[PDB]
């Protein structure tokens, strides 16, 4: 009942040289992730896609960081690289893909809104 308690994978097809990854859900709805999950995914992306677990506990502002992280792992976006003297959390290639897609969408919106304040259209 351990594997059945897990959330469903969002990785349909992992990326390879001849294909982009196919992710369940759509970017417009953050691939069905809740906001806490999106926040954590972007936090991981912002810190190089690799970071000690204790930093996640201390720095994200989440009440239950481990639960949020386990969902990202179940989705196929992150994994544990446990090693001598502590565990390291790393984004998978699919997690990097999704994190970057969301970051770019967010930035395009920020740029659009910035351009509306004063016309400097080239």
From TrEMBL:
Domain MLPTv-like winged helix-turn-helix, which positions? 23-105
* Pfam families for this protein: MLPTv-like_HTH
Which Gene3D superfamilies does the record cross-reference, listed alphabetically?
A: Winged helix-like DNA-binding domain superfamily/Winged helix DNA-binding domain (1.10.10.10)
* Protein name, per record: TVG0766549 protein
């Amino acid at each position: 009942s351990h594997m059945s308690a897990m959330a469903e994978s969002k990785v349909l097809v992992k990326g390879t040289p001849f294909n982009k990854p196919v992710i369940k859900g759509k970017l417009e709805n953050n691939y069905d992730m809740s906001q806490d999950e999106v926040s954590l995914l972007l936090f991981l992306k912002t810190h190089g896609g690799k970071i000690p677990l204790y930093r996640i506990k201390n720095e994200t502002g989440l009440k239950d960081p481990e639960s949020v992280l386990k969902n990202l792992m179940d989705y196929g976006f992150a994994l544990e690289d446990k090693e001598r003297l502590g565990e390291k959390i790393v984004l998978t290639s699919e997690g990097e893909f999704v994190a970057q897609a969301i970051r770019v969408r967010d930035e395009e919106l920020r740029l659009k809104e910035m351009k509306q304040k004063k016309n400097v259209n080239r």
